[PDB]
Write a protein that binds this ligand. Structure first.
Ligand code: ZN
Lengths: 102, 192
């Protein structure tokens, strides 16, 4: 309705990656493709590997998720984020991955 | 800038130990000529202690009689367990390692020979403890996202050993060690 700034103050360094994707849907990662795009841009991930990363969250494997967390942070630091946001971004992505629609 | 393994398993670790007593000491000798040291730490046993001591000293390497104890979750009478590296400070510590070993088999044997933090406190005199591998208590609570228990458990061990307790840090190609060693680095820094 044009009654809340869709801000990204939680992830200031990741804002420039988050906006172009999530401004179409007012900041809420509703679709699966948006989580793949975030993953691919923020973490320097392959778009094809971002498809795999969605399935790993869907499967929610016990300790195999920590392999991706490490992978995500390694790329994340190389792009812009200070590795305080990258881990908490992964918390957001995994959380909205459960109800992510095609 | 030199190194000395304090957590090493020999052939006397009957299940998973593959390192023979002879060829191990010469590798440690050939790698580090200047004051070589090696610690025998085997899984819930002290079989090689005497043979390791007299062969190490025969090669000019200083032996450190260790013991990777299986520590029970609560009590040793409970019928899983946790890892914990213990190192002998002096001869009193050697006698205390011999007792903890003995009570592991005699009293607290369920699947492995297990010990307790009760009896560890009883025979803590002369033991340098380390935090242990991923299979140990504090690192396992960190993996469970229960930092309050990890720290609580850290306080319990610090009441036992005091200034003899240390934070064991080991790194292979494993993502679980990055989360643990990070949280252990904070604990290491918080409690002096
Ligand atoms: Zn172990």
């Amino acid at each position: 309705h044009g009654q809340e700034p869709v801000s990204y103050a939680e992830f200031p360094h990741a804002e420039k990656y988050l906006r172009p994707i999530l401004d179409e849907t007012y900041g809420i990662p509703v679709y699966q493709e948006q989580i793949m795009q975030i993953a691919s841009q923020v973490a320097g991930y392959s778009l094809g590997e971002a498809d795999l990363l969605r399935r790993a969250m869907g499967k929610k494997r016990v300790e195999e998720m920590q392999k991706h967390r490490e992978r995500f942070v390694r790329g994340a630091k190389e792009r812009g984020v200070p590795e305080e946001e990258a881990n908490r971004l992964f918390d957001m992505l995994e959380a909205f991955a459960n109800y992510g629609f095609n | 800038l030199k190194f000395a393994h304090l957590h090493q398993h020999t052939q006397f670790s009957l299940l998973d130990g593959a390192a023979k007593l002879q060829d191990l000491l010469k590798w440690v000798k050939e790698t580090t000529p200047e004051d070589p040291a090696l610690a025998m730490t085997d899984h819930g046993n002290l079989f090689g202690a005497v043979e390791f001591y007299k062969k190490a000293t025969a090669m000019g390497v200083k032996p450190i009689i260790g013991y990777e104890a299986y520590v029970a979750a609560e009590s040793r009478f409970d019928r899983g367990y946790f890892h914990l590296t213990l190192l002998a400070k002096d001869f009193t510590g050697y006698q205390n390692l011999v007792r903890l070993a003995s009570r592991a088999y005699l009293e607290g044997f369920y699947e492995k020979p297990r010990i307790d933090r009760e009896i560890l406190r009883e025979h803590a005199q002369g033991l340098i403890a380390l935090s242990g591998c991923l299979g140990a208590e504090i690192p396992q609570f960190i993996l469970q996202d229960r930092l309050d228990l990890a720290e609580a458990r850290l306080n319990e061990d610090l009441s036992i050993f005091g200034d003899r307790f240390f934070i064991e840090i080991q790194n292979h190609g494993l993502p679980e060690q990055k989360k643990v060693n990070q949280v252990l680095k904070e604990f290491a820094r918080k409690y002096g």
